[PDB]
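User: Hi! Is it possible to get a structure for several chains at once, not just one? Here's what I have:
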Amino acid sequence: MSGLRPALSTFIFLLLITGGVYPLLTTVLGQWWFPWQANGSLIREGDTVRGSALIGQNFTGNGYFHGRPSATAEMPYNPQASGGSNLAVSNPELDKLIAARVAALRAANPDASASVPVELVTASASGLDNNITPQAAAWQIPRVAKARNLSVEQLTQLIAKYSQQPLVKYIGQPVVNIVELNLALDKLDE
Amino acid sequence: MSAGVITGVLLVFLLLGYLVYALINAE
Amino acid sequence: MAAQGFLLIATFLLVLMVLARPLGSGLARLINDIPLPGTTGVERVLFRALGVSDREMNWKQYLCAILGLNMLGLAVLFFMLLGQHYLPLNPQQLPGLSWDLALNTAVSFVTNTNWQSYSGETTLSYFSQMAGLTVQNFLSAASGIAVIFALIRAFTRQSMSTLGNAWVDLLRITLWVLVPVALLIALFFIQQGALQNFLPYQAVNTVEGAQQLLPMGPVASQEAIKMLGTNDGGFFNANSSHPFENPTALTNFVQMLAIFLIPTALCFAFGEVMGDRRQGRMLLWAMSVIFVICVGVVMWAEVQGNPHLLALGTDSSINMEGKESRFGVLVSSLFAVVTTAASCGAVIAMHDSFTALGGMVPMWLMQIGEVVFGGVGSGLYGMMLFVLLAVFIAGLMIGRTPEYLGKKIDVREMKLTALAILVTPTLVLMGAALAMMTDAGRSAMLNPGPHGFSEVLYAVSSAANNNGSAFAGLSANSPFWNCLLAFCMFVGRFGVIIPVMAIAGSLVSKKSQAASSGTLPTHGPLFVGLLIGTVLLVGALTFIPALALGPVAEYLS
Amino acid sequence: MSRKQLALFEPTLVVQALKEAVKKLNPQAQWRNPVMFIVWIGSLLTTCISIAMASGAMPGNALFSAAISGWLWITVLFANFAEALAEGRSKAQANSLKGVKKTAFARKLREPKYGAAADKVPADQLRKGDIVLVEAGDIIPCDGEVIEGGASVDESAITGEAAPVIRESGGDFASVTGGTRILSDWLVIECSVNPGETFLDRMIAMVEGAQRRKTPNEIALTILLIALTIVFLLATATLWPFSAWGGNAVSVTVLVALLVCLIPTTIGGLLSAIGVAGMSRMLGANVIATSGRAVEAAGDVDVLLLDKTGTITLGNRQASEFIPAQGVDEKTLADAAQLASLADETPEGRSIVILAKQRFNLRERDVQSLHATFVPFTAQSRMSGINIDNRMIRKGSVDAIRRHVEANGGHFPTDVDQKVDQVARQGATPLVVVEGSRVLGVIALKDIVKGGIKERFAQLRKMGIKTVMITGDNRLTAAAIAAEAGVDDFLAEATPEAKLALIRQYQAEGRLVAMTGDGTNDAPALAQADVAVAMNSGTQAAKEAGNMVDLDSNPTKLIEVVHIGKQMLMTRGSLTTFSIANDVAKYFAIIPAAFAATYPQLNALNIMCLHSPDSAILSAVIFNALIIVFLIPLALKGVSYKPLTASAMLRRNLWIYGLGGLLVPFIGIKVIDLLLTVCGLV
Ligand SMILES: CCCCCCCCCCCCCCCCCC(=O)OC[C@H](COP(=O)([O-])OCC(O)COP(=O)([O-])OC[C@@H](COC(=O)CCCCCCCCCCCCCCCCC)OC(=O)CCCCCCCCCCCCCCCCC)OC(=O)CCCCCCCCCCCCCCCCC
Ligand SMILES: CCCCCCCCCCCCCCCCCC(=O)OC[C@H](COP(=O)([O-])OCC(O)COP(=O)([O-])OC[C@@H](COC(=O)CCCCCCCCCCCCCCCCC)OC(=O)CCCCCCCCCCCCCCCCC)OC(=O)CCCCCCCCCCCCCCCCC
Ligand SMILES: Nc1ncnc2c1ncn2[C@@H]1O[C@H](COP(=O)(O)OP(=O)(O)CP(=O)(O)O)[C@@H](O)[C@H]1O
Ligand SMILES: [Rb+]
Ligand SMILES: [Rb+]
Ligand SMILES: [Rb+]
Ligand SMILES: [Rb+]
Ligand SMILES: [Rb+]
Ligand SMILES: [Rb+]
Ligand SMILES: [Rb+]
Ligand SMILES: [Rb+]
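Assistant: Yes, the chains can be modeled jointly so their relative placement is included. Here is the combined structure:
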């Protein structure tokens, strides 16, 4: 003893409090109060999970709103990697990727403006970005409208319906839930 | 690594040891 | 954009000061060894049951208590990470970590750096992520606050030899500041959308037809304490900016507030304990001027962004690369400066994809020793060495004996202050030189040219200065990188904790001279500018040769 | 010393006579200066590198490495030159005051008389316990107290005072020192110094300390300079692997040049010069201070403690007037005073008889030795007198005689009180005399203040030092003396244990107090005080107790002591601030120059538009060498100190020296590079 019993007692009690009670109380209160948000904000049709309202998925069809590029390890928009492209400003590989993305987006959206938004050509910080700006979502109205036989007014109303704005404009940006918007597009088709 | 880098690193460690000894002592 | 950035800085600082002043009074009550209201009796039962008799301890005994707690935590965490295949809460049956990786992350989470060279969702189980790497998130923060409690007690106590009970301090901090505030923060994060469960990984049949595996786990409970205790970490590879960790802009703002909460409340507590609020307002002004200047510089650099984006056909030149669309470049720049000045390490954005100036200023903010609302406890006792340098220089140029808060600052204080200051630049320069001289350190680069050296220098600076943030283009999972950064983190914390404790134990024995007519006031704009100039000049002249070959060369290229 | 004044810092003789020693400060005995030892090792390394290039090595440009090595050697020579110049100025003062040991004659009297045995001995053979006899005109062969007789003494050869100093047997004017000349009459003194511990030896130990002790502020500044040397050495030595990854690595000679240009060579070379020049200026203000630690600790004095009889007043104190009481005749008053002052050796007691017998023209002609029974003066008793007969005669202060007469049975009259506070309002110190519980009367003791010191006390008020007057006189006489002298406050009727209690009271408050005294009475109080400015006119006990002794006997010499002490600290801090501030322009001159082939894009940082990388680095090294020479006069003279507020003076020092260390190296490097380009060597 003599400085060993208080050391072990304090460390063991703090271990118990901050690895037992505190995460258990946090989990119990989370599942009791906000279970959908605490379980991942999963989206289901039937009994099959169609995705999360926060993570985002790889979209490549013409009738689907495309999100920001992803730089996860195995596949684009891979939740098992959840990294970003750590490419420098001076890196020529980043410029090559940006040029390829700009050429692909201009090929895919001919009726849109030639100035592609930076959101759709820059890889996000985590790869799993479910959000784009409403300007970037309204830049790709003609492609989705031509692929879906919808109206520009209907598409803009759907984007404004699925647009989330922060409490004040300077702590963030207005965003569009891409997965929820595409699921609403599918439901409007059905 | 050649002899020059070894000599440089040895000189830097000797200077650092002398300076740390001087900082510890009241010469 | 400039108006929005100014409004963001002003709102963040205003809400921070408003939230931090009552916590300043609360922490001052723990410095003065006065129990919090409502905690009396519970303390009497609990300390007696544990075996803590509230005996007061010297600096040697206090430091031995802190080091013994940290070594016990290191051993427990390291063996838990090695044996994570034999422990419950493993819904993926992930194997045990290797020796080098386990040692590196154990030293990371014990020495409050929380560096991570792995991918969390494919490396760590729920038990090793919750009962480890969160217990240490509490414990390293509590140890830092205990050391700064000892330093403030040394400044406020006259002619005694003891520094209070380290076990009482750690228990009070963890039970009454770290736990009940992080519980509310975790509950708010769960409300906003952060994960908190123990489910297996949820397979997703996507809209198009592909299959992705969503990882689950107790995310928000760890996120709250890594933001409260200025820790890095993250359930996932992205520290922050993962939607399951930082879902909303309100969550991000609360994260920044929690990062600067305790380091600002510590300055408020110091000012209240000394009896002069100007002594805390001086430190707050000296931190805030540097912080605002750095935030403005990084915001302007990120707004200018990539010059090739406009040439290659994009809409703007704004550096949106490696940043989340749920935030902006302004919010990303503010968060980057907050975490690299606060020794936090959480990243809202890939700092590797930042511009040259916006990667230099966070790197330099780490390199100055994390004094600008720095690490929890460690920021205050790191700037309390530059304050000793400033009062020594100012006392020389006024002709008086150097003196801070009445107590004289003699040869032993200067020796230990120099030894404490020397630890982090020495480790940064030796680690960067050893990584540059070794192919095992040099081959971890991702970006060529000067920016690979920027990656190496950023990694070594974050390890030595207990930040934990990374460019993340560096493949730091090598055994050489793991051992090098483990040594850097270990020495960079425990070679500063020891001489600060020695300074405290040599300053308790002194007496406080009363204020005279010729005594220099350690507050006001003159001393704030003097301390600011000392900090910026030392942190510049130490690292201009290192910074001129990386981000400066990249900017001028 | 004031007279025989020191010449200019550069009289063009000691410059050569000390640069000859500077050429002998070059070898490896610089281990005690780490900042200069780093420059020495770097210079030797660059010399070996240039020799290797001259004899055949991998790189080229042997001329550039040779010039860098030569200018680093020149930097070492300059930084040793400042130290040796200060040390040789101190040795010049030491040789000026070293020729005082002249005489080889000393009489050996067996008993203290007018003359007992004229046995001549060499003065070096004098030890403690011996007595000598000096005539009118001879010089003093030893340092000690005076046993019998008084004589006017000319202390010009030691202090510089052309005015003679009176030395009289007994009292606080008994200590005499060697080298001085008797001007009046015979004098018998005692030998109180052994060979090797005289006042001249104390002077030589002050000015010519071979192992000169470093003050704690100097040691702490040395620690900070070592720490700056360590961080700059690491940041410079780690530049080679970084440039190696960048491409072609930087050359070792350019790295050594940057290392010397970064570390604080200026303050690191001028620190010892600052200390030795501070000792030289300290002795030049006629103070013999044992410790530079004491000199620097005197800089934060906020309260100064002064004696009144021996310090503020000259200490002659003639008994100017006669004052009798009711039922008392002047014959009885003068007789009582003369009998009480027969065997008294105090200056007041001698003055009593030597004016009273001539004033009344009547004298009780017997000496005190016939039926002798005499009691001396003890300060705590504060009373003296004679009791040769069954009757008793005593004289002393009002409180002493009042306690004596209440002990006997009588009482002190109100008429006597009226005369006492009347003469106290006049200013003379009253000594009340008594015979058989009868208060005969008082004696007016007129005293003279040491010139116009009210301006110096106003200066002490402006500098922030509150001065009080410690004495043992009455509460009203001390009030009048304080009003004449212009001091802030006073403490009267103070026994020396109460003075020591006041020292402990002001010292336990946290204030670092200073005391000025001359007598053996104030010797333990001076030894207790933090700063003790003793007086040369006082006693050897007070001189030994005090950590610094005056020679001009000025009450306000603490002004000059604080001047040189704060000049030391301010010069150290100012040159430190200049040295760290200088590195910004060194970076702006060397970094775009050193990284000019590995990274050609770094030329945008060349804001000075220097001609070439070699010219830039060589000009930076030239300025690093020349700033030491350009700051030798500042190190040898001290910075200009004005009695400002602490905050305002810090602001002034930051402005001047920080802005100088910022902008001056830019101008200096640009001018040196322009001169080099014009001359054509680069
Ligand atoms: C070059 C760059 C320069 C950078 C500048 C950086 C400046 C940062 C300053 C650092 C702050 C630390 C020091 C102050 C802390 C303590 C505050 C204090 O004591 O007050 C008195 C203090 C000194 O007064 P004193 O006479 O010595 O003592 C009086 C006592 O303290 C009297 O005590 P009291 O009882 O009256 O007060 C207690 C309580 C009394 O009231 C209460 O009881 C509680 C009231 C609040 C309760 C909640 C109500 C709701 C309020 C909203 C809060 C929401 C939180 C709740 C959460 C929900 C959120 C929805 O009120 C408080 O709790 C604190 C008062 C508010 C603090 C203000 C925060 C300071 C920073 C904010 C501005 C920074 C902007 C600069 C950045 C932008 C530049 C780009 O005055 C100050 O506050 C100084 C700061 C003033 C603002 C900064 C001025 C500069 C701003 C412009 C910068 C220009 C830069 C130019 C850049 C280029 C632009 C073009
Ligand atoms: C090497 C570089 C060399 C540098 C060269 C320059 C150095 C000399 C500069 C001389 C300038 C010429 C004189 C200008 C005077 C006018 C300017 C002025 O107002 O400031 C006065 C100031 C003197 O003030 P003071 O006499 O001590 O204060 C007592 C008052 O007079 C009366 O007493 P009071 O108690 O009544 O005062 C009340 C109030 C007085 O102030 C007031 O607030 C006005 C009264 C309003 C009502 C009171 C309510 C207060 C609540 C509102 C407060 C917000 C106001 C601030 C707004 C934002 C401003 C940013 O004070 C306070 O409230 C305390 C709170 C603190 C105020 C906030 C401090 C502002 C941030 C300072 C930023 C400086 C950045 C410089 C960076 C340089 C880095 C190189 O003089 C200065 O100009 C200082 C500024 C320059 C700093 C010097 C930089 C030194 C760097 C050297 C580093 C050394 C390197 C070491 C190397 C070796 C290491 C080993
Ligand atoms: N010959 C004498 N016999 C008796 N009393 C005397 C005396 N000479 C002086 N005194 C008195 O004794 C007291 C001693 O005062 P004094 O001037 O010596 O104290 P002080 O502190 O001012 C000088 P110091 O500390 O050198 O003795 C005074 O009251 C003085 O009047
Ligand atoms: Rb951290
Ligand atoms: Rb530093
Ligand atoms: Rb930290
Ligand atoms: Rb630090
Ligand atoms: Rb830190
Ligand atoms: Rb430093
Ligand atoms: Rb330093
Ligand atoms: Rb220098």
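Chains D and A do not touch (no CB pair under 8 Å). The pocket of rubidium ion (ligand 9) is lined by residues C 421, 425, 538, 542; D 231 (CB under 6 Å).

User: Great, thank you!
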